[PDB]
Amino acid sequence: TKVLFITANPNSAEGSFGMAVGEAFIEAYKNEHPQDEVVTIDLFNTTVPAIDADVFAAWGKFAAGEGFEALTEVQQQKVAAMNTNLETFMNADRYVFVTPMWNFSYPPVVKAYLDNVAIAGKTFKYTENGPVGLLEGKKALHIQATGGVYSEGAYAAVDFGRNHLKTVLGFVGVNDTEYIAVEGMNANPEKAQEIKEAAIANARELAKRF
Amino acid sequence: TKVLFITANPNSAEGSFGMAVGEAFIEAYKNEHPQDEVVTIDLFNTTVPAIDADVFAAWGKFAAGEGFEALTEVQQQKVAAMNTNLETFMNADRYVFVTPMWNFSYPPVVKAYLDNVAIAGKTFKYTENGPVGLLEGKKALHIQATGGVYSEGAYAAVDFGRNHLKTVLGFVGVNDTEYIAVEGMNANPEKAQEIKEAAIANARELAKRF
Numbered sequence: 001t002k003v004l005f006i007t008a009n010p011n012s013a014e015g016s017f018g019m020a021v022g023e024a025f026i027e028a029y030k031n032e033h034p035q036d037e038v039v040t041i042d043l044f045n046t047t048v049p050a051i052d053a054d055v056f057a058a059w060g061k062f063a064a065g066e067g068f069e070a071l072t073e074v075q076q077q078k079v080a081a082m083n084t085n086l087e088t089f090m091n092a093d094r095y096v097f098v099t100p101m102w103n104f105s106y107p108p109v110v111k112a113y114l115d116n117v118a119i120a121g122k123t124f125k126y127t128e129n130g131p132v133g134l135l136e137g138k139k140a141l142h143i144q145a146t147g148g149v150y151s152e153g154a155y156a157a158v159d160f161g162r163n164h165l166k167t168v169l170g171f172v173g174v175n176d177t178e179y180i181a182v183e184g185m186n187a188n189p190e191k192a193q194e195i196k197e198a199a200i201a202n203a204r205e206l207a208k209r210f
Numbered sequence: 211t212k213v214l215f216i217t218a219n220p221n222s223a224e225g226s227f228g229m230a231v232g233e234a235f236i237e238a239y240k241n242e243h244p245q246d247e248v249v250t251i252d253l254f255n256t257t258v259p260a261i262d263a264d265v266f267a268a269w270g271k272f273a274a275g276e277g278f279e280a281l282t283e284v285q286q287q288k289v290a291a292m293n294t295n296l297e298t299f300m301n302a303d304r305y306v307f308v309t310p311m312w313n314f315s316y317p318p319v320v321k322a323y324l325d326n327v328a329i330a331g332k333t334f335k336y337t338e339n340g341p342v343g344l345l346e347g348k349k350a351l352h353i354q355a356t357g358g359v360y361s362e363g364a365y366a367a368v369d370f371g372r373n374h375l376k377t378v379l380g381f382v383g384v385n386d387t388e389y390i391a392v393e394g395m396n397a398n399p400e401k402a403q404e405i406k407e408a409a410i411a412n413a414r415e416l417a418k419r420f
């Protein structure tokens with residue numbers, strides 16, 4: 001089994017609630033499955049090209065059935081990085097995403113990564129009734145840390161990071177998703193440590209059945 | 211009246227349905243108010259720093275009450291671009307955003323932009339019972355181009371770019387908003403020219419009352 005541990009937090013497990021929880025998850029997981037390969041993708045230190053005029057131009061050459069040498073140097077560099085990211089995603093069996101909630105959503109590089117990974121003909125295809133995913137046999141976990149509480153109730157409707165990430169994963173075929181919220185630390189700073197510990201314990205149990 | 215024309219499309223009006231609608235809106239608007247100042251902010255051609263370890267470190271210094279020169283040169287460049295974006299936004303009276311739908315949301319740079327503009331003490335404050343916007347006297351328009359149809363009914367639940375943008379604007383005090391969908395082109399390519407013209411007329415009418 002190949003696992004991607006995809007993190008989008010500028011802070012380490014020492015200074016981030018999500019990363020402490022994701023770290024506890026991924027280490028309990030390796031312990032349970034010492035023969036599994038686990039690759040960390042730190043999105044703040046990975047090249048994750050934004051879809052821009054260069055990518056659109058590169059795509060036009062490929063659609064025009066042209067080769068890689070028709071691209072400029074920067075287009076080449078952009079496409080080769082997008083290709084790597086796509087190919088690593090497609091080949092792994094399990095995905096762990098760790099995000100903080102910023103302004104009701106995830107950090108911008110998460111959308112940039114999703115844009116690398118959701119590709120027609122590769123991870124989804126067009127159907128008589130509309131798009132369907134191509135990826136089969138995958139499972140995903142989203143661990144999200146949030147100042148307030150959005151995991152259930154009325155505030156769930158503004159949890160855009162979680163809701164959008166789950167939608168795109170389902171769109172590419174990854175309908176088997178798990179969710180861990182590390183929530184309420186800013187609404188109750190007195191309970192932050194126990195909130196963290198409870199989610200850590202939640203993650204370590206999840207590791208035994210993921 | 212200062213208008214911000216905030217575009218997130220790699221094509222200009224020539225190859226983007228949203229840009230053709232947004233450009234028509236802006237021309238009709240200038241005809242009605244020749245004295246208004248419209249400033250273009252092309253997010254594909256503007257420095258919009260992502261919040262990262264540098265930014266978190268800079269903010270840590272500002273919180274310690276250190277000065278600008280206690281920052282590394284990299285931190286100063288990111289912070290200076292962030293403050294320029296925040297100040298330009300705070301000072302304008304009108305916002306017109308134009309975005310494509312990519313994978314059920316907007317381009318990543320829109321999230322990076324929102325993260326520069328939603329700042330505690332500047333565009334919102336904490337109160338007893340919840341965060342509150344600080345911006346008054348503002349109006350926004352969102353023009354969104356989408357391949358499918360999401361503006362009403364069931365599929366509105368996955369129109370995450372639209373929904374998130376509205377949420378963040380509302381959080382910062384901009385509750386007076388207008389929305390224009392340019393939708394269904396991909397689902398109905400024989401209708402793309404009619405869809406575009408109908409949406410253009412929709413924009414020209416709004417331009418007279420916006």
Ligand SMILES: Cc1cc2nc3c(=O)[nH]c(=O)nc-3n(C[C@H](O)[C@H](O)[C@H](O)COP(=O)(O)O)c2cc1C
Pocket residue numbers: 009011015016017018019099100101102103104105145146147148149185186261
């Ligand atoms: C830039 C920024 C934006 C934030 N926006 C929200 C928000 O919209 N809603 C919320 O409940 N908390 C918000 N928070 C609080 C964080 O979600 C909370 O600190 C969380 O623990 C961050 O995750 P981490 O500890 O793994 O970094 C924000 C924090 C930052 C730094």
Ligand SMILES: Cc1cc2nc3c(=O)[nH]c(=O)nc-3n(C[C@H](O)[C@H](O)[C@H](O)COP(=O)(O)O)c2cc1C
Pocket residue numbers: 051219221225226227228229309310311312313314315355356357358359395396
């Ligand atoms: C990378 C990419 C992703 C897209 N994702 C979606 C999508 O999730 N849902 C949809 O209805 N259309 C999607 N589309 C189609 C566009 O929304 C549609 O072509 C729209 O016109 C683009 O806006 P524009 O013409 O102003 O550039 C996508 C197009 C591209 C190029």
Ligand SMILES: O=S(=O)(O)c1ccc(/N=N/c2c(O)ccc3ccccc23)c2ccccc12
Pocket residue numbers: 103147148186187330341
């Ligand atoms: O790093 S901090 O833990 O100090 C921190 C916490 C919350 C922060 N913002 N929180 C909220 C926010 O930005 C918006 C809505 C919220 C609703 C409920 C609870 C919290 C929030 C924040 C913003 C900038 C820098 C550091 C921040």
Ligand SMILES: O=S(=O)(O)c1ccc(/N=N/c2c(O)ccc3ccccc23)c2ccccc12
Pocket residue numbers: 118120131312313314357358396397
């Ligand atoms: O440039 S195109 O106008 O031909 C174009 C149209 C739709 C495209 N659609 N992508 C979709 C997509 O990524 C997800 C959901 C969709 C639902 C309905 C219709 C389209 C989509 C697309 C994707 C990549 C490059 C060019 C694209």
Ligand SMILES: [Ca+2]
Pocket residue numbers: 202
């Ligand atoms: Ca549990």
Ligand SMILES: [K+]
Pocket residue numbers: 023027
């Ligand atoms: K480790």
Ligand SMILES: [K+]
Pocket residue numbers: 217218219220252253254255
């Ligand atoms: K643009």
